[PDB]
């Protein structure tokens, strides 16, 4: 039972992953590496590299994938894609995803020159439409052809979905209309796509076998992490408090969206601890504490001074001291492991986040209706992603310095974009009197209907994505893995804030299929 701490605290004690499995994975990895670098027709190679990514394995082959695509992009030979929408769109997306610029004008030949509308003759090319839809999300601001490609391909895919013969292709198109691949969380999409790929006609059985084995090996790390985190959480006693039922496993599932690789296990555990405390303390500020209790919680945190903590009731004192202790533990890990005391930075982002909660609480108490901009300036902090992302930078940056930490903590556009997206996606996740959420703020500000206000907020999602996309073609003071963390928290937000069955059964199925049950090997 995904929700049961007895079961969770036992996870990791044993695994059905053997040393046999690991040796087999080493052998299969060498052949997949060889397939990516080796001879293939260029469309077949793009399709292979896309499958590797969708199976969750870009982390194993990123150098080979980049080297293969660099080769393909430096081709005098272009007759294999020019005039072929499916090939043009796949090439466009995979090159932009891997830092190789392709201009939007590659799609101009598929438009009517008078209207700028895509040609009627495309309206029944399902794989072309699907590739053009997926490609459109790699667009930047002012790339008008890609804005049109999105609205055209969405409308045409909706129209043709029911006309598709191939049951696998129909499943893929349904999945894409729910969320484009660019917006999906990698680990969750990997588990979905392993089953889809197995049923594809062009399926490579070596790649499928590697995908299953690597999936199970990575899952064994996750199970050991969940065990440690569940034992920690029960140790805090916060599992017994009223707030955030299931906050620990909710946090961890979101963290798997941010980062799933085994080599980032200790970072992931620390991010998951912070996320569990965010959901708990969100409830303290929202429901449980009095204004005097919250002001004292905030002041203690701002001063990093726990002298007055016994003035708080037990159920508020315990979350505060766990936030304090965990923040000190995480800053200390940075000192021991990375040579840099991170406590000033964990304490600062917690103080900022509690200030942002206190401001929401004061707006509610005084019946304030902020503007959308006023709300988002605060709500990009209250969502918790400045806290989580600054922490993740602290823990991973090579050669941490005060200058480097001060720059990320200042939320430059790349980082701020991610934080705003996570907030507005969360707010959109509530289906159609709360003056303090995105849609209602915009309604109060402009007198828009809910429908029109929702469309406006959805347009902001697309805009901020375009800004992220372009930021990734610019030189950055950031490097991997932080560059990936910043994109992947947004994909974790999309995945867990969508709107048969119910939210409970859907979540349980994702947790059980990704974290608990191995994939069956023959
Ligand atoms: Ni459908």
């Amino acid at each position: 039972n995904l929700w049961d701490y007895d079961f969770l605290q036992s996870l990791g004690r044993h695994s059905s992953v053997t040393e046999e499995h690991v040796g087999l994975a080493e052998k299969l990895k060498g052949e997949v590496k060889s397939l990516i670098t080796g001879p293939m027709e260029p469309l077949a190679k793009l399709e292979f590299i896309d499958s590797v990514r969708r199976l969750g394995l870009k982390y194993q082959f990123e150098t080979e994938m980049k080297e293969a695509l660099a080769n393909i992009s430096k081709d005098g030979y272009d007759s294999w894609w020019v005039d072929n929408l499916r090939a043009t769109a796949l090439r466009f997306r995979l090159l932009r995803e891997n830092g190789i610029f392709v201009p939007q004008d590659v799609f101009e030949r598929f438009q009517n020159k008078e209207t700028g509308k895509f040609k009627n003759e495309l309206c029944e090319d399902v794989k072309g439409l699907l590739n053009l839809y997926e490609a459109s999300f790699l667009g930047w601001e002012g790339e008008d052809i890609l804005d049109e490609a999105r609205t055209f391909s969405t409308a045409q895919l909706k129209n043709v979905e029911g006309k598709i013969s191939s049951p696998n292709l129909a499943k893929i198109v349904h999945h894409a209309l729910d969320l484009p691949l660019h917006w999906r969380a990698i680990r969750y999409e990997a588990r979905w796509f392993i089953d889809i790929y197995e049923d594809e006609e062009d399926m490579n059985p070596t790649l499928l076998k590697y995908a299953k084995l690597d999936f199970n090996i990575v899952q064994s790390f996750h199970q050991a992490e969940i065990g440690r985190l569940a034992r920690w959480w029960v140790g805090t006693g916060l599992d017994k408090l009223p707030f955030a039922r299931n906050g620990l496993i909710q946090s961890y599932m979101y963290a798997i969206g941010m980062l799933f690789e085994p080599h980032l296990g200790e970072v992931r555990e620390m991010e998951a601890k912070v996320g569990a405390l965010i959901t708990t303390i969100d409830d303290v500020y929202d429901v449980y504490g009095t204004m005097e209790e919250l002001e004292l919680f905030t002041d203690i945190t701002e001063r990093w001074d726990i002298n007055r903590v016994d003035q708080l009731p037990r159920n508020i004192r315990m979350p505060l001291l766990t936030m304090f202790n965990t923040s000190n533990d995480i800053g200390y890990w940075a000192l021991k492991e990375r040579g840099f005391n991170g406590i000033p930075y964990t304490a600062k982002v917690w103080a900022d986040q509690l200030k942002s909660y206190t401001k929401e609480a004061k707006w509610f108490h005084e019946g304030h209706k902020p503007t959308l901009e006023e709300y988002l300036e605060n709500a990009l902090v209250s969502i918790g992603f400045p806290n989580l992302l600054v922490t993740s930078y602290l823990l991973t940056v090579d050669n941490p310095t005060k200058e480097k930490l001060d720059y990320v903590d200042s939320l430059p556009l790349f980082v701020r974009a991610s934080c705003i997206l996570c907030r507005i996606i969360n707010d959109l996740g509530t289906s159609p009197g709360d003056n303090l959420k995105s849609i209602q703020c915009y309604m109060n500000e402009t007198g828009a209907s809910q429908e029109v206000a929702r469309e406006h907020i959805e347009g902001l999602v697309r805009m901020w994505w375009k800004r992220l996309n372009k930021c990734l073609f610019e030189p950055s003071p950031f490097t991997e893995p932080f560059l990936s963390f910043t994109i992947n928290v947004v994909r974790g937000s999309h995945f867990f804030y969508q709107y048969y069955g119910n939210a409970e059964s859907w979540t349980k199925n994702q947790g059980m299929s990704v974290l608990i049950h191995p994939i069956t090997l023959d």
Side-chain angles (χ1 to χ4, degrees):
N1 195 290
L2 192 61
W3 313 131
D4 188 78
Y5 288 114
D6 282 348
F7 171 63
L8 294 178
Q9 298 181 83
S10 79
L11 222 41
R13 295 320 194 184
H14 205 227
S15 167
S16 60
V17 168
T18 58
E19 83 281 281
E20 197 268 343
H21 284 135
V22 172
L24 191 44
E26 290 162 20
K27 149 161 133 68
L28 284 163
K29 179 176 175 178
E31 187 51 20
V32 174
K33 190 174 312 215
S34 178
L35 288 168
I36 296 166
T37 60
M40 250 189 236
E41 298 157 322
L43 183 56
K45 178 65 61 79
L46 290 184
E47 284 168 341
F48 191 86
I49 287 171
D50 199 37
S51 313
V52 167
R53 174 262 177 95
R54 263 202 117 126
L55 290 166
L57 302 170
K58 177 167 182 186
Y59 82 105
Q60 290 286 21
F61 303 111
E62 206 199 339
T63 290
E64 290 89 353
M65 292 160 65
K66 172 60 184 259
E67 175 202 342
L69 291 169
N71 249 285
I72 287 165
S73 74
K74 297 179 192 129
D75 218 344
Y77 164 56
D78 72 1
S79 67
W80 60 262
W81 64 266
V82 166
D83 274 3
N84 180 316
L85 174 63
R86 171 188 168 177
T88 295
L90 188 58
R91 175 180 179 281
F92 174 97
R93 175 167 66 77
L94 262 59
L95 270 51
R96 280 204 179 193
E97 284 173 348
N98 287 278
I100 300 163
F101 187 73
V102 181
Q104 63 169 351
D105 65 36
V106 301
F107 296 115
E108 217 177 339
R109 77 177 58 231
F110 303 103
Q111 294 176 285
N112 174 301
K113 67 154 178 286
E114 321 289 359
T115 59
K117 301 288 160 226
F118 281 86
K119 287 175 163 160
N120 287 341
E121 74 208 305
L122 300 176
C123 283
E124 295 181 56
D125 169 15
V126 178
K127 293 187 152 170
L129 288 173
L130 176 62
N131 287 355
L132 178 64
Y133 173 83
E134 295 288 16
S136 78
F137 291 90
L138 274 291
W140 305 350
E141 289 195 283
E143 292 188 320
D144 52 293
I145 297 174
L146 305 178
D147 300 341
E148 187 67 26
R150 183 191 58 92
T151 58
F152 175 72
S153 66
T154 303
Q156 296 314 128
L157 284 172
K158 288 179 175 173
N159 186 66
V160 305
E161 185 188 352
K163 305 177 174 63
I164 294 164
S165 284
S166 161
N168 230 37
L169 187 55
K171 286 193 200 164
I172 293 172
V173 168
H174 185 78
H175 193 80
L177 286 170
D178 272 357
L179 284 174
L181 177 61
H182 193 56
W183 292 3
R184 282 179 171 283
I186 299 165
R187 186 63 172 173
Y188 296 96
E189 178 68 3
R191 180 63 187 89
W192 178 86
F193 190 66
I194 284 168
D195 292 347
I196 295 285
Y197 186 65
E198 177 166 350
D199 287 341
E200 285 284 277
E201 221 203 333
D202 353 48
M203 182 271 283
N204 183 299
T206 299
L207 177 53
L208 175 70
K209 188 179 178 183
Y210 181 58
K212 289 183 183 195
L213 188 56
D214 193 69
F215 192 95
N216 285 355
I217 294 169
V218 169
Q219 178 190 72
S220 75
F221 287 87
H222 298 158
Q223 288 171 357
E225 293 164 14
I226 296 166
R228 284 190 286 277
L229 287 163
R231 290 189 295 268
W232 165 79
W233 191 237
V234 166
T236 72
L238 297 184
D239 61 312
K240 300 298 193 180
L241 300 205
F243 333 115
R245 220 203 121 216
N246 302 330
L248 187 284
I249 196 61
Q250 169 190 32
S251 177
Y252 185 75
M253 285 182 62
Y254 216 138
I256 286 285
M258 182 182 187
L259 76 175
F260 69 84
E261 301 95 300
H263 73 101
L264 288 168
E266 288 190 280
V267 174
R268 172 165 51 262
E269 288 179 48
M270 286 182 272
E271 297 296 312
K273 290 186 170 178
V274 176
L277 286 163
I278 288 168
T279 192
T280 301
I281 295 167
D282 179 26
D283 288 344
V284 168
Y285 274 72
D286 182 37
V287 170
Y288 194 80
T290 70
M291 289 288 337
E292 172 178 288
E293 287 161 358
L294 301 183
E295 281 177 9
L296 179 56
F297 199 143
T298 301
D299 187 59
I300 287 170
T301 309
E302 285 184 84
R303 293 190 284 109
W304 216 243
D305 175 351
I306 54 158
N307 265 286
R308 290 198 170 260
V309 78
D310 290 336
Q311 295 178 213
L312 297 170
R314 164 179 186 83
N315 288 349
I316 301 183
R317 213 180 313 164
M318 278 172 66
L320 190 163
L321 288 170
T322 297
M323 168 208 74
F324 182 80
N325 289 356
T326 289
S327 298
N328 290 331
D329 287 341
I330 291 173
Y332 185 87
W333 187 99
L335 178 53
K336 172 272 307 191
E337 191 59 32
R338 311 296 294 162
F340 182 87
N341 173 13
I343 302 177
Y345 306 94
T346 59
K348 181 188 179 278
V349 293
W350 270 106
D352 293 347
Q353 191 174 350
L354 300 190
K355 283 188 270 219
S356 79
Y357 290 161
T358 302
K359 176 170 289 187
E360 284 171 353
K362 290 189 162 150
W363 288 345
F364 176 81
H365 171 73
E366 304 187 1
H368 182 57
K369 298 173 191 293
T371 65
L372 179 60
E373 183 54 42
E374 180 182 0
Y375 166 76
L376 289 176
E377 184 69 40
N378 191 64
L380 76 87
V381 182
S382 71
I383 194 67
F385 283 95
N387 183 347
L388 290 159
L389 284 170
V390 167
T391 301
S392 79
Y393 185 79
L394 168 68
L395 297 175
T396 64
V397 67
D398 287 314
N399 302 318
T401 71
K402 174 181 209 302
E403 292 173 26
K404 286 175 183 206
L405 265 295
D406 282 348
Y407 176 64
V408 185
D409 172 74
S410 74
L411 308 185
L413 182 77
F414 177 61
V415 180
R416 190 171 45 96
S418 176
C419 295
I420 292 164
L421 277 160
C422 291
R423 163 56 60 193
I424 61 179
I425 294 157
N426 188 297
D427 290 4
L428 279 171
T430 308
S431 263
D434 189 342
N435 298 130
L436 304 190
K437 302 287 182 155
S438 294
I439 295 173
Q440 300 96 312
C441 284
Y442 185 73
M443 286 170 70
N444 295 154
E445 176 154 18
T446 71
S449 62
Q450 194 277 153
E451 166 174 275
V452 167
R454 179 170 299 265
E455 281 176 17
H456 181 74
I457 303 305
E458 287 169 355
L460 291 183
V461 172
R462 294 197 294 274
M463 180 188 75
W464 282 109
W465 261 113
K466 288 171 192 182
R467 292 179 178 181
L468 282 184
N469 288 340
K470 187 166 196 289
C471 289
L472 287 177
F473 270 84
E474 307 281 344
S476 170
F478 306 127
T479 68
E480 296 287 358
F482 184 72
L483 285 173
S484 287
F485 295 164
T486 297
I487 306 305
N488 284 319
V489 295
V490 182
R491 292 169 169 168
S493 302
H494 286 292
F495 187 63
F496 287 115
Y497 295 99
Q498 305 176 247
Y499 76 84
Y500 303 96
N502 56 94
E504 163 87 332
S505 65
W506 182 91
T507 302
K508 166 144 210 188
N509 174 61
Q510 291 302 145
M512 292 299 295
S513 66
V514 170
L515 293 177
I516 301 314
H517 297 134
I519 304 176
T520 291
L521 317 173
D522 304 314

